[PDB]
Design an enzyme around this catalytic site. Structure first.
Site, mmCIF file in Angstrom:
data_model
loop_
_atom_site.group_PDB
_atom_site.id
_atom_site.type_symbol
_atom_site.label_atom_id
_atom_site.label_comp_id
_atom_site.label_asym_id
_atom_site.label_seq_id
_atom_site.Cartn_x
_atom_site.Cartn_y
_atom_site.Cartn_z
ATOM 1 N N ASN A 186 90.905 24.545 77.708
ATOM 2 C CA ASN A 186 91.568 25.232 76.608
ATOM 3 C C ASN A 186 92.030 24.272 75.497
ATOM 4 O OD1 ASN A 186 91.294 27.638 78.158
ATOM 5 N ND2 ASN A 186 93.549 27.972 78.279
ATOM 6 N N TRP B 105 81.559 28.134 62.890
ATOM 7 C CA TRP B 105 81.727 26.932 62.067
ATOM 8 C C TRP B 105 81.197 25.696 62.769
ATOM 9 C CZ3 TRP B 105 87.609 27.939 61.002
ATOM 10 C CH2 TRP B 105 87.703 29.042 60.153
ATOM 11 N N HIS C 56 74.776 27.751 57.688
ATOM 12 C CA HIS C 56 75.853 26.903 57.230
ATOM 13 C C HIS C 56 76.436 26.027 58.319
ATOM 14 C CE1 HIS C 56 77.827 30.612 58.744
ATOM 15 N NE2 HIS C 56 78.490 29.645 59.289
ATOM 16 N N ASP D 110 83.473 29.713 51.589
ATOM 17 C CA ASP D 110 83.665 28.294 51.441
ATOM 18 C C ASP D 110 82.867 27.574 52.498
ATOM 19 O OD1 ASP D 110 85.282 29.203 53.640
ATOM 20 O OD2 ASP D 110 86.771 27.715 53.262
ATOM 21 N N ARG E 135 70.360 35.942 68.384
ATOM 22 C CA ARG E 135 70.836 36.836 67.349
ATOM 23 C C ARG E 135 71.166 35.878 66.197
ATOM 24 N NH1 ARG E 135 75.150 38.319 63.512
ATOM 25 N NH2 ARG E 135 76.350 36.914 64.901
ATOM 26 N N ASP F 177 72.537 34.982 62.545
ATOM 27 C CA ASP F 177 73.583 35.321 61.644
ATOM 28 C C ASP F 177 73.147 35.234 60.211
ATOM 29 O OD1 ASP F 177 76.557 35.373 60.818
ATOM 30 O OD2 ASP F 177 75.931 33.438 60.097
ATOM 31 N N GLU G 141 71.451 39.966 61.704
ATOM 32 C CA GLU G 141 72.388 40.921 61.169
ATOM 33 C C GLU G 141 72.262 41.004 59.651
ATOM 34 O OE1 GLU G 141 76.683 40.378 61.959
ATOM 35 O OE2 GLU G 141 77.055 42.014 60.637
ATOM 36 N N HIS H 59 81.642 43.325 66.007
ATOM 37 C CA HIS H 59 82.577 42.411 65.314
ATOM 38 C C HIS H 59 82.692 42.602 63.810
ATOM 39 C CE1 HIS H 59 78.612 40.808 64.863
ATOM 40 N NE2 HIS H 59 79.130 40.095 63.904
ATOM 41 N N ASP H 60 81.811 43.349 63.110
ATOM 42 C CA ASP H 60 81.975 43.529 61.680
ATOM 43 C C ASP H 60 82.439 44.870 61.192
ATOM 44 O OD1 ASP H 60 81.641 41.025 60.420
ATOM 45 O OD2 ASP H 60 79.534 41.168 60.580
HETATM 46 CA CA LIG Z 1 89.297 28.127 78.850
#
Ligand SMILES: [Ca+2]
Ligand SMILES: [Ca+2]
Length: 686
Positions: free
Chosen positions: A33, A101, A140, A196, A227, A229, A257, A327-328
């Site tokens: 984590n 990202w 990106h 950005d 999939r 993006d 998508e 998710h969108d």
């Molecule tokens: Ca974890």
């Protein structure tokens, strides 16, 4: 192997996909984590890491939670290493919990796990007959400000530990530097930055080869689907070379998508699903499904017209991934919503054409608006909710009933709030009745189906108030009342004696690549595969059985072919059209033409002597070309996938509707690169 085997990486119509946001499903290892301001163990701040990981998904495959629902493929967040910054946007701290990202596409995101954890996930999933699809986001890297190199990690890209470059001081031009998109044109959305995010430059040979080598590595680790993006934001010609790298190497189901809104029908979206080599997340199904079952902004005639229209407009409709939320968009279940609405829309998606995907937590009636509210950690792993049981009862039928995996859709009875449709594949039938009106019974009279005589029990077992159907001679059923909110599914399966093709994958590849053809009735003895009139028999057919044939594409000219199968007895199947044989391996070349002035409605196009260029036919020419961002009018430019390592001939032309104006002079010639990119910069020859 049969069409339904976990090993069938090419086609997914027999599967049900469970889309997981890895961080938000189960923390099976807390030592990996994130710590400090990047972590929120309570998952109350939905932009930080909550701790969910790949060991968490292994645990829910093992203990029966995902396999008890009948899910056969999982779609997880992008597995690659992401930036580690906590970015504060106007007060809120944000992290890369979502996987979008990237900073190194050749290593894992350690919050999700190590490469050994990724391999254990692939092996556990496959040992349980689950396929693994991963996000891949090549458009990106991550948030960046060239003016402020200290913001975030300045979009830096690394290659297996080695820094290639950053967004500030990009002397290699690895990234685009045109500002950020305002979404006004498709061109604008491609070459300018999304918000950005440091926009990758696929015309740079280093970026091109790197991304193509990164995806092959993930293919080597056993993923079963991709999939992609933001496909609306990358050059179509570069995505075609990217699909050609996947398919000519290790073809797996790839879909992208391209968001559509309510009542948005877009030519470009369909053109993409029909010509890119990948399919799309079927937003036209999802928005219409939500209009009819959730929001009541349209009724069953709308639903019918969408099912009838989409079977035509998508050249390969059995490859589109359907859904009611993801998710969108806002979660389908609302606070003040009836659970029956969700349970019906899920039974609809599970028996409809395409590849159904279920967003994690749908079986636990999660609500929440838009991002990040639709990505909460799922609250419970209860296996007894009505929704879990619906999926559990219906998701098996994709494997056992080929009419649900491949069949045509036929409306059998309809009024404003009831649709009864039939799925038909050879002799296999499934009939589904749905009453969306929650308070009025529906009287069904005069329903004719293709089911043989008999008393068919509802596969849902009456849990959404379904009933038995009695079918007499000629497929006619005894009259019945469909309960308020009633949903029933009735089915019959047997053998086809005839070859029938339900799906083919990949649909674009060069000579020598093994494709997979799935369906029923092929027989056990090896028969013949036709590409056009070319017959492929014997050794070139790698595998033949009744539900699946694997065969090598013959050395045919490049272009569009019709596939047909003949069993050993000479009986032939239906035609599966639009297969694209490529001239050979692909490379993207940027074509730039100067001094091509045009009139209103007149645009520039490219054509030439290979299929990839439309073989000299104006109606199939590449374009219209772009002329605003990278170069400006009268210079026009376009990135085109063309065959690698060879001399092509071509000419540019202007098209104003009906009228074609070719360039004068001799034909242009160019010898293409074997890998990487190239730029053609020429001047309009009158
Ligand atoms: Ca974890
Ligand atoms: Ca882009």
């Amino acid at each position: 192997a049969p069409d339904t085997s976990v090993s069938n990486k090419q086609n997914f119509s027999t599967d049900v996909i469970y889309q997981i946001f890895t961080d938000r499903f189960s923390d099976g290892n807390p030592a990996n984590n994130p710590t400090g301001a990047a972590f929120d163990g309570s998952c109350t701040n939905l932009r930080l890491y909550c701790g969910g990981d790949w060991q968490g998904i292994i645990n829910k495959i093992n203990d029966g939670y995902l396999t008890g629902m009948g899910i056969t493929a999982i779609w997880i967040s992008q597995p690659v290493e992401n930036i580690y910054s906590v970015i504060n946007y106007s007060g809120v701290n944000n992290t890369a919990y979502h996987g979008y990202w990237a900073r190194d596409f050749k290593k894992t995101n350690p919050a999700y796990g190590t490469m050994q954890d990724f391999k254990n996930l692939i092996d556990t999933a496959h040992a349980h007959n689950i396929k693994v699809i991963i996000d891949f986001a090549p458009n990106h890297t991550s948030p960046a400000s060239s003016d402020d190199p200290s913001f975030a990690e300045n979009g830096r890209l690394y290659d297996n530990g080695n820094l290639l470059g950053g967004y500030t001081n990009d002397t290699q031009n690895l990234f685009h530097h045109y500002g950020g998109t305002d979404f006004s044109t498709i061109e604008n959305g491609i070459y300018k930055n999304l918000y950005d995010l440091a926009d990758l430059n696929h015309n740079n040979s280093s970026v091109d080869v790197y991304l193509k080598d990164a995806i092959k590595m993930w293919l080597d680790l056993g993923v079963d689907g991709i999939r992609v993006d933001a496909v609306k934001h990358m050059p179509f010609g570069w995505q075609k070379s990217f699909m050609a790298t996947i398919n000519n190497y290790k073809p797996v189901f790839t879909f992208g998508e391209w968001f559509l809104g309510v009542n948005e029908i877009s030519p470009e979206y369909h053109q993409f699903a029909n010509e890119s080599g990948m399919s799309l997340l079927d937003f036209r199904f999802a928005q219409k499904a939500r209009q009819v079952f959730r929001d009541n902004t349209d009724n069953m005639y709308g639903l019918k017209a969408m099912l009838e229209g989409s079977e035509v407009d998508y050249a390969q409709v059995n490859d589109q991934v359907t859904f009611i939320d993801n998710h969108d968009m806002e979660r389908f279940h609302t606070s003040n919503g009836d659970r029956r609405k969700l349970e019906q829309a899920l039974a609809f998606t599970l028996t409809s054409r395409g590849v159904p995907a279920i967003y994690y937590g749908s079986e636990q009636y999660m609500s929440g608006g838009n991002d990040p509210d639709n990505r909460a950690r799922l609250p419970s792993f209860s296996t007894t909710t009505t929704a879990y049981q619906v999926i559990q009862k219906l998701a098996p039928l994709r494997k056992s009933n080929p009419a649900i995996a491949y069949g045509s859709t036929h409306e059998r009875w309809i009024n404003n709030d009831v649709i009864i449709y039939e799925r038909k594949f050879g002799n296999n039938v499934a009939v589904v009745a749905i009453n969306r009106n929650m308070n009025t019974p529906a009287s069904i009279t005069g329903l004719v189906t293709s089911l043989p005589r008999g008393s068919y029990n509802d596969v849902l077992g009456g849990i959404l108030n379904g009933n038995t159907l009695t079918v007499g001679a000629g497929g006619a059923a005894s009259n019945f009342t469909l309960a308020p909110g009633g949903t029933a599914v009735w089915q019959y399966t047997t053998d086809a004696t005839t070859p029938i093709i339900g799906n083919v994958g990949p649909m674009m590849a060069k000579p020598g690549v093994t494709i997979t053809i799935d369906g029923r009735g092929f027989g056990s003895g090896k028969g013949t595969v036709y590409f056009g009139t070319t017959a492929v028999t014997g050794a070139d057919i790698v595998a033949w059985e009744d539900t699946q044939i694997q065969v090598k594409i013959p050395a045919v000219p490049g272009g569009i072919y019709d596939i047909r199968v003949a069993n050993a007895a000479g009986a032939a199947s239906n035609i599966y059209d639009n297969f694209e044989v490529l001239t050979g391996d692909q490379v993207t070349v940027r074509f730039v033409i100067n001094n091509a002035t045009t009139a209103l409605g007149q645009n520039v196009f490219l054509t030439g002597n290979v299929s990839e260029l439309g073989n000299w036919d104006p109606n199939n020419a590449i374009g219209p070309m772009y002329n605003q961002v990278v170069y400006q009018y009268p210079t026009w430019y376009y990135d085109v996938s063309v065959p690698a390592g060879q001399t092509i001939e071509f000419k540019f032309l202007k098209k104003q509707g009906s009228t074609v104006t070719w360039e004068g002079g001799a034909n242009r010639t160019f010898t293409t690169p074997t890998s990487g990119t190239a730029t053609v910069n020429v001047n309009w020859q009158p």
